[PDB]
């Protein structure tokens, strides 16, 4: 009875791991495509599956971090959203923390995305007229040339400054979408998606 | 591009169907075992997966009804829980409605469970001192000998009447657990559980 219960629990853990990879792939695809409602529903499903998982491999922690990173990026302009226990941390600051924690290559693309999130974390505060909050986000992030231009823009209250149009929110999203394409290629071969693709193909 | 998007959406629908069957099996097992916290977490996951499914086969609608039925039975004593748009309907009354909708055999066990839910729908109102609500649940359900004993118990305010000890909440749960064992046997062969069981066995 206890041996059967144990084997069942191990099988549920295997299946939850397969569901996590599939939901991550679906979340990545919805983000890349701009399917806002599918992203919201898929995120809700990923969150619930994650609460049913206890022990995680390094690969599963990376998968969860990718889901959490895209969720904060999708909420980047929602300044009322609180992703951390410290209520002062904005969504883009929370995405920046996860970006620096993922076990991944620090290639040129990694650093470009990092710097684009930093500029936009300040930009989104300025665009909402939250000038003192922009300065507080600046101090938390920064923790010379790039740093000093940003402090000058904050002090002038230059909300629609051309610097934010050159390193825009759209540019940040496009660079992140290039990274998402690589996650999509890497996870397209995971168990659940492969088996489901084989079913659809066999009916064609 | 549209052909690929279409094939991907079909594969996501296949995978969501496999996840629904697996989550139903896990929910049934947690209910049978009395694993309250695992039931709560599994229910949250089933709800989210169901919102990501659009077209349902007759088999998938039956699977969803089984999940909804067990959720209302688990909440049978939570008289503040509102499962229907009509706020007057109690959780056991909502379970009774689903029980009468499932495409299943009306064998002796089906009717015994039905009558046990009817008695307990009244019993739970009486036990909370909600005498007028017990009479209202009675009128909505009933909708001669069984009916008249119940109306007499309600009018006397006989909360701890021996009739409710003979056709108890425990007796209702045990009969429902016998039905759950049959659902467990039937869904143990579904794709995701079978594949996960094969993985665990191969590591022994
Ligand atoms: C709201 C939140 N969603 N999430 C989240 C977590 C895992 C997968 C997808 C999303 C957070 O961490 C906070
Ligand atoms: C609360 C509720 N949970 N549910 C539910 C639905 C599907 C699966 C599991 C549970 C309801 O219908 C209302
Ligand atoms: Ca805020
Ligand atoms: Ca109530």
Curated annotation (Swiss-Prot), chains A, B:
Keywords: Acetylation, ADP-ribosylation, Cell cycle, Cell division, Chromosome, Cytoplasm, Cytoskeleton, DNA-binding, Isopeptide bond, Mitosis, Nucleus, Phosphoprotein, Telomere, Ubl conjugation
Result when mutating residue 56 to R: Loss of interaction with FBXO4
Tissue expression profile of the protein: Highly expressed and ubiquitous. Isoform Pin2 predominates.
Gene Ontology MF annotations: ankyrin repeat binding; DNA binding; DNA binding, bending; double-stranded telomeric DNA binding; G-rich strand telomeric DNA binding; identical protein binding; microtubule binding; protein homodimerization activity
Effect of residue 155 to A: Loss of phosphorylation; induction of mitotic entry and apoptosis and increased radiation hypersensitivity of ataxia-telangiectasia cells
UniProt PTM comment: Phosphorylated preferentially on Ser-155 in an ATM-dependent manner in response to ionizing DNA damage.
Name this polypeptide is given: Telomeric repeat-binding factor 1
Organism encoding this protein: Homo sapiens (Human)
Included range, full protein: 60 to 268 of 439
């Amino acid at each position: 009875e206890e041996e059967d219960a144990g084997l069942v629990a191990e099988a549920e853990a295997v299946a939850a791991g397969w569901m996590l990879d599939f939901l991550c792939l679906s979340l990545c695809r919805a983000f890349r495509d701009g399917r806002s409602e599918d992203f919201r529903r898929t995120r809700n499903s990923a969150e619930a599956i994650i609460h049913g998982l206890s022990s995680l491999t390094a690969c599963q922690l990376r998968t969860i971090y990718i889901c959490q990173f895209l969720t904060r990026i999708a909420a980047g302009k929602t300044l009322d959203a609180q992703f951390e226990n410290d209520e002062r941390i904005t969504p883009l600051e929370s995405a920046l923390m996860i970006w620096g924690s993922i076990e991944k290559e620090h290639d040129k693309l990694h650093e470009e995305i990092q710097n684009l999130i930093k500029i936009q974390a300040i930009a989104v505060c300025m665009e909402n007229g939250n000038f003192k909050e922009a300065e507080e986000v600046f101090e938390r992030i920064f923790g010379m040339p790039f740093k000093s231009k940003l402090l000058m823009i904050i002090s002038q209250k230059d909300t629609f400054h051309s610097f934010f149009q050159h390193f825009s929110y759209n540019h940040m999203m496009e660079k992140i979408k290039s990274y998402v394409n690589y996650v999509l290629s890497e996870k397209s071969s995971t168990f659940l998606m492969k088996a489901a693709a084989k079913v659809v193909e066999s009916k064609r």
